[PDB]
Design an enzyme around this catalytic site. Sequence first.
Site, PDB file in Angstrom:
ATOM      1  N   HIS A 142     -33.074  50.310  56.678  1.00  0.00           N
ATOM      2  CA  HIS A 142     -33.948  50.193  55.569  1.00  0.00           C
ATOM      3  C   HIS A 142     -33.207  50.723  54.381  1.00  0.00           C
ATOM      4  O   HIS A 142     -33.211  50.100  53.349  1.00  0.00           O
ATOM      5  CB  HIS A 142     -35.149  51.055  55.862  1.00  0.00           C
ATOM      6  CG  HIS A 142     -35.913  51.385  54.642  1.00  0.00           C
ATOM      7  ND1 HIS A 142     -37.204  50.963  54.521  1.00  0.00           N
ATOM      8  CD2 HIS A 142     -35.624  52.169  53.567  1.00  0.00           C
ATOM      9  CE1 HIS A 142     -37.656  51.467  53.366  1.00  0.00           C
ATOM     10  NE2 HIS A 142     -36.721  52.169  52.743  1.00  0.00           N
ATOM     11  N   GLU A 143     -32.619  51.899  54.550  1.00  0.00           N
ATOM     12  CA  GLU A 143     -31.913  52.500  53.429  1.00  0.00           C
ATOM     13  C   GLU A 143     -30.706  51.670  52.984  1.00  0.00           C
ATOM     14  O   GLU A 143     -30.441  51.423  51.790  1.00  0.00           O
ATOM     15  CB  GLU A 143     -31.586  54.023  53.550  1.00  0.00           C
ATOM     16  CG  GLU A 143     -32.822  54.933  53.662  1.00  0.00           C
ATOM     17  CD  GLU A 143     -33.738  55.045  52.456  1.00  0.00           C
ATOM     18  OE1 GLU A 143     -33.350  55.030  51.297  1.00  0.00           O
ATOM     19  OE2 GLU A 143     -34.991  55.219  52.796  1.00  0.00           O
ATOM     20  N   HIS A 146     -31.442  48.842  50.676  1.00  0.00           N
ATOM     21  CA  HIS A 146     -31.678  49.144  49.285  1.00  0.00           C
ATOM     22  C   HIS A 146     -30.400  48.877  48.534  1.00  0.00           C
ATOM     23  O   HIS A 146     -30.412  48.367  47.447  1.00  0.00           O
ATOM     24  CB  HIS A 146     -32.208  50.600  49.113  1.00  0.00           C
ATOM     25  CG  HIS A 146     -33.707  50.913  49.367  1.00  0.00           C
ATOM     26  ND1 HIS A 146     -34.724  50.172  48.784  1.00  0.00           N
ATOM     27  CD2 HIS A 146     -34.342  51.914  50.089  1.00  0.00           C
ATOM     28  CE1 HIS A 146     -35.880  50.723  49.135  1.00  0.00           C
ATOM     29  NE2 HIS A 146     -35.701  51.749  49.959  1.00  0.00           N
ATOM     30  N   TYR A 157     -37.652  50.417  41.314  1.00  0.00           N
ATOM     31  CA  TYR A 157     -38.498  51.341  42.068  1.00  0.00           C
ATOM     32  C   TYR A 157     -39.654  51.905  41.266  1.00  0.00           C
ATOM     33  O   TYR A 157     -39.679  53.044  40.809  1.00  0.00           O
ATOM     34  CB  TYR A 157     -37.718  52.501  42.695  1.00  0.00           C
ATOM     35  CG  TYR A 157     -37.968  52.760  44.202  1.00  0.00           C
ATOM     36  CD1 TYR A 157     -38.027  51.772  45.201  1.00  0.00           C
ATOM     37  CD2 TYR A 157     -38.032  54.074  44.691  1.00  0.00           C
ATOM     38  CE1 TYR A 157     -38.157  52.065  46.575  1.00  0.00           C
ATOM     39  CE2 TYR A 157     -38.169  54.385  46.058  1.00  0.00           C
ATOM     40  CZ  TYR A 157     -38.241  53.390  47.044  1.00  0.00           C
ATOM     41  OH  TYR A 157     -38.376  53.736  48.413  1.00  0.00           O
ATOM     42  N   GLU A 166     -39.155  48.107  48.732  1.00  0.00           N
ATOM     43  CA  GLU A 166     -39.320  48.892  49.961  1.00  0.00           C
ATOM     44  C   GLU A 166     -39.678  47.959  51.109  1.00  0.00           C
ATOM     45  O   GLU A 166     -39.228  48.153  52.242  1.00  0.00           O
ATOM     46  CB  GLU A 166     -40.525  49.824  49.723  1.00  0.00           C
ATOM     47  CG  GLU A 166     -40.162  51.222  49.256  1.00  0.00           C
ATOM     48  CD  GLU A 166     -39.333  51.892  50.304  1.00  0.00           C
ATOM     49  OE1 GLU A 166     -39.766  52.213  51.373  1.00  0.00           O
ATOM     50  OE2 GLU A 166     -38.098  52.073  49.959  1.00  0.00           O
ATOM     51  N   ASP A 226     -45.798  58.418  44.356  1.00  0.00           N
ATOM     52  CA  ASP A 226     -44.828  57.643  45.112  1.00  0.00           C
ATOM     53  C   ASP A 226     -44.399  56.411  44.345  1.00  0.00           C
ATOM     54  O   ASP A 226     -44.320  55.344  44.925  1.00  0.00           O
ATOM     55  CB  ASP A 226     -45.313  57.384  46.566  1.00  0.00           C
ATOM     56  CG  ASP A 226     -44.503  56.475  47.441  1.00  0.00           C
ATOM     57  OD1 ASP A 226     -45.060  55.477  47.830  1.00  0.00           O
ATOM     58  OD2 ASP A 226     -43.243  56.860  47.750  1.00  0.00           O
ATOM     59  N   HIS A 231     -44.157  52.984  48.728  1.00  0.00           N
ATOM     60  CA  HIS A 231     -44.182  53.100  50.158  1.00  0.00           C
ATOM     61  C   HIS A 231     -45.570  52.741  50.647  1.00  0.00           C
ATOM     62  O   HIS A 231     -45.814  52.678  51.841  1.00  0.00           O
ATOM     63  CB  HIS A 231     -43.855  54.557  50.482  1.00  0.00           C
ATOM     64  CG  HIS A 231     -42.398  54.898  50.286  1.00  0.00           C
ATOM     65  ND1 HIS A 231     -41.983  55.746  49.270  1.00  0.00           N
ATOM     66  CD2 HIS A 231     -41.294  54.520  51.027  1.00  0.00           C
ATOM     67  CE1 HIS A 231     -40.656  55.814  49.413  1.00  0.00           C
ATOM     68  NE2 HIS A 231     -40.201  55.120  50.470  1.00  0.00           N
TER      69      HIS A 231
HETATM   70 ZN   LIG Z   1     -36.909  52.909  50.908  1.00  0.00          ZN
HETATM   71 ZN   LIG Z   2     -38.395  55.425  51.288  1.00  0.00          ZN
END
Ligand SMILES: [Zn+2]
Ligand SMILES: [Zn+2]
Length: 316
Positions: A142-143, A146, A157, A166, A226, A231
């Site tokens: 997932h990271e 990005h 973001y 995300e 957030d 998220h």
């Molecule tokens: Zn993320």
């Molecule tokens: Zn995250």
Amino acid sequence: ITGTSTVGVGRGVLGDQKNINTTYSTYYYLQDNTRGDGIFTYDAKYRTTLPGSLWADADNQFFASYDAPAVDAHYYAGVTYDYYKNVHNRLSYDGNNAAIRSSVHYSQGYNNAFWNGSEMVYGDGDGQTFIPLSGGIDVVAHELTHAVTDYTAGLIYQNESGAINEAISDIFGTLVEFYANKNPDWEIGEDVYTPGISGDSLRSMSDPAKYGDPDHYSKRYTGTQDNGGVHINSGIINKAAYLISQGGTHYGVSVVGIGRDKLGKIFYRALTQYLTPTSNFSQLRAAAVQSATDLYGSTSQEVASVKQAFDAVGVK
Ligand SMILES: [Zn+2]
Ligand SMILES: [Zn+2]
Ligand SMILES: [Ca+2]
Ligand SMILES: [Ca+2]
Ligand SMILES: [Ca+2]
Ligand SMILES: [Ca+2]
Ligand SMILES: [Zn+2]
């Protein structure tokens, strides 16, 4: 560092044993040369400076509990790479075989993990909420996603933009999980999250609501936290993707499932070819169908299921 390509082995964060591309010079390192421009895993030694030292192991055996996370980081980073290369013909996240560097043992009881624009940094968890984050492949992925994103649509973001961003990571992070073919699922962080509890995760793509997340536009978060709810609102895109793949009846709307692959394709492509740093949900819908389109025809089923999913999440 320069040396011999070797293949070590150790056991990951979940006790899993596995092998890994190292490089040998006096000691053995968390350096894989099989992977494009290479993958390096560093010891941060609970420090905060980055990346710390290139991981050296005396014997090519990594079983020490301290090892676990390096392994995972290192290993998942390659699994992921293979995924993108193999499946989408993408080389490293910049597509140019940039190298991938990870730092583990960052800080103390650091419940987080991330891409810092230049690399992957992993906390270790506190042992209650988490455990070393690299333990979770979907997380790693997932990271890493990005970045890829960074290198492509350059989504922002904050708000919808951020929610898709995300979403995207969750998606590919999940495709990667399936990709590895070990305990895949439609949950995120299942594997590193809240050690004590079984059956939980951070979030569910299959049933966002299970975690308190939106599963319908109409329920989109509009707050401030957030980052406008990135998220959270991902929940919405998540059900949609999930649906596309797997089908179902959501709020009365029936989706015909077309499979992980297709999904993969659709998305990967809308993202590389159609998203603007500011794309919103609808924009997201539009890209998708358009890429579905390019891939399978204005009349494909695919296109259709793509519409259903979004029709179904109140994103039009
Ligand atoms: Zn993320
Ligand atoms: Zn995250
Ligand atoms: Ca050793
Ligand atoms: Ca899993
Ligand atoms: Ca998962
Ligand atoms: Ca748990
Ligand atoms: Zn439903």
